[PDB]
């Protein structure tokens, strides 16, 4: 029992973290096989960031302008190319600790672990979600660029996020591992802001199932709402619409607890309208939306990794 | 910016996790150099747990009664001893992934990372605190015994917890890496319960400093308090006494924010008396007490 915000074990990723320096700019890189991945703004000065032509700026760099450090070893850069907003540095040595991996672009509402790094050295691990507005509520200081987000299935690391920037509200924006930003953000020094966000309804429902699984049932009510009636109330509280696809996804948790998805919707509706009334759910005084249905099942069933 | 419940990177610990089996009982072990550490109840059947004499039970075992598996490789047990509530199995192979490590017994209020494991395989990592009642609010299913708690400083792993058991309220109890339980708990099947818990005052103050560092001041006020007056109010809300040592420990955060410790105490006092009134602090509607002053400095600075 117990239910905690839980990250994937970070070991497989720790073995891939390096430091990348170009001129006066230093940040983190990800070393997989004979390639090191990092934010392309590593090649920029402050002047350049106002209106960078990255093609032009990169052409002005040689292999020897990049200093890549793994632990206490300098890796020899033998090639460089840009892919969208990430730089790829080909090195003469394949990382012997390379895990089985893939790169995946995730959807909003999906969660992942972040390994926060500074100077190529792992500092900490925490769990986050891609918000509906394509930011993440991370914890990152200057120097954290190139830290990555990931999931693990059995022995395979799916990298989904590379950190690039912070927005005025203190939330974070970045790319997939192929350098495409999540959301409309750009790697140029120009005014940028997070859009209005919404609550990830399917995840709140998942967390309510987690609560039931852990013996926390005070909020249950069996006045089964309809999807339409529910979404009317959701709209009002700035919750994402719940689709039939979300209902299907909640199937296993519904079956495990014997509580119909639309009954849990009825409970959530009541929670939104009346609040928690001084009570907590899984130790929280607010409705939590950064556990997916998958996360709940994994944590409640004891799934492990190789 | 941002503030998250944050764990240490778990790689150094992952490389130490093994599966230990005796008879019908399987749990996790920690493999450091040529020794594997695990809960001594690995040697028990359910009958034995009612009133175990572990000295008597262990003397009935041989080295070959213990099956240790690292990955898909069987380690040969060549010795065994009991130390308090942990079993130590000497194996013929030193773990090549052994990090620099020490064993430390922590105080209530201190935080650590937990690497939850099943069948010697890592499942997840999370951060928790040793509660004043010497339990932890973890997430553990049957099979998680032998999972460990730890801190990391530069390259050195300080192991502070091995998991043994769950209490009726769903909280968790265990030992240090030398097998001494935190709290009054015993590794016998008999009625046990968590005592009434208290809030870790020094940590709440630390987290309020975290909030200020990240740009939130709404809960501050113009008042100060004395340590004595503050503790009078704390007592009433089931908060731990704040000592001068705690005040000294909060020094760096005080200096960084320019808010005197006793001024933040005045803010906390007001928060306890009036509540938050539907406002949040760092995304929380409750006062959070599982970040130490060191955790705040580590995460907010560097």
């Amino acid at each position: 029992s117990g239910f905690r915000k839980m990250a994937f074990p970070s070991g497989k990723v720790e073995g891939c973290m390096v430091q990348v320096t170009c001129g006066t700019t230093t940040l983190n890189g990800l070393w997989l096989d004979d390639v090191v991945y990092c934010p392309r703004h590593v090649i920029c000065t402050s002047e350049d960031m106002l209106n960078p032509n990255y093609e032009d700026l990169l052409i002005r760099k040689s292999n020897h302008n990049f200093l890549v450090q793994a632990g206490n070893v300098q890796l020899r850069v033998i090639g460089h190319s840009m892919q969208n907003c990430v730089l790829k540095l080909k090195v003469d040595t394949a990382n012997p600790k390379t895990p089985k991996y893939k790169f995946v672009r995730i959807q909003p509402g999906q969660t992942f672990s972040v390994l926060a790094c500074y100077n190529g050295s792992p500092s900490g691990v925490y769990q986050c979600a891609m918000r509906p507005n394509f930011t993440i509520k991370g914890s990152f200081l200057n120097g954290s660029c190139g830290s990555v987000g990931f999931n693990i299935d059995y022995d395979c690391v799916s990298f989904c996020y590379m950190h690039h920037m912070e927005l005025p509200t203190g939330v974070h924006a970045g790319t997939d591992l192929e350098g495409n930003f999540y959301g409309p953000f750009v790697d140029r020094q120009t005014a940028q802001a997070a859009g209005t966000d919404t609550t990830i309804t399917v995840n709140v429902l998942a967390w309510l199932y987690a609560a039931v699984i852990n013996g926390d049932r005070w909020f249950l009510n069996r006045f089964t709402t309809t999807l339409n009636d529910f979404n009317l109330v959701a709209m009002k509280y700035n919750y994402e619409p719940l689709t039939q696809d979300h209902v299907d996804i909640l199937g296993p948790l519904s079956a495990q607890t014997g509580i119909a998805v639309l009954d849990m919707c009825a409970s959530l509706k009541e929670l939104l309208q009346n609040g928690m009334n001084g009570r907590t759910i899984l130790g929280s005084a607010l409705l939590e939306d950064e556990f997916t249905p998958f996360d709940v099942v994994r944590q409640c069933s004891g799934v492990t990794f190789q | 910016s941002g503030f998250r419940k944050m764990a240490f990177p778990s790689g150094k610990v992952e490389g130490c996790m093994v599966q230990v089996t005796c008879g019908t009982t399987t749990l996790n072990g920690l493999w450091l150099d040529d020794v594997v550490y695990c809960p001594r109840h690995v040697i028990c059947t359910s009958e034995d747990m009612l009133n175990p004499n572990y000295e008597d039970l262990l003397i009935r075992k041989s080295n070959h009664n213990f099956l240790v598996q690292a990955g898909n490789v069987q380690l040969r047990v060549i010795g065994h001893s009991m130390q308090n509530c942990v079993l130590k199995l000497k194996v013929d192979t030193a773990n090549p992934k052994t990090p620099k490590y020490k064993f430390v017994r922590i105080q209530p209020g201190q935080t650590f990372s937990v690497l939850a494991c099943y069948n010697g395989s890592p499942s997840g990592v999370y951060q928790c605190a040793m509660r004043p009642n010497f339990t932890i609010k973890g997430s553990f299913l049957n099979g998680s015994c032998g999972s460990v708690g730890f801190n990391i400083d530069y390259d050195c792993v300080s192991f502070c917890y091995m998991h043994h058991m769950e209490l009726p309220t769903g909280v968790h109890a265990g030992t240090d890496l030398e097998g001494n339980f935190y709290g009054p708990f015993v590794d016998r099947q008999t009625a046990q319960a968590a005592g009434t818990d208290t809030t870790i005052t020094v940590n709440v103050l630390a987290w309020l400093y975290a909030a200020v560092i990240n740009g939130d001041r709404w809960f501050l006020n113009r008042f100060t308090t004395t340590l004595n007056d503050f503790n009078l109010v704390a007592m009433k809300y089931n908060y731990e006494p704040l000592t001068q040592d705690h005040v000294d420990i909060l020094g760096p955060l005080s200096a960084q924010t320019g808010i005197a410790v006793l001024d933040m105490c005045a803010s906390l006092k007001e928060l306890l008396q009036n509540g938050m009134n539907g406002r949040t602090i760092l995304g929380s509607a409750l006062l959070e007490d599982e970040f130490t002053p060191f955790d705040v400095v580590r995460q907010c600075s560097g």
Partner: peptide, 13 residues
């Protein structure tokens, strides 16, 4: 702004 020392990151934007 960007979380890489001299590229002008300012808390709050």
């Amino acid at each position: 702004x960007f979380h890489x020392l001299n590229l002008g990151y300012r808390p709050g934007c």
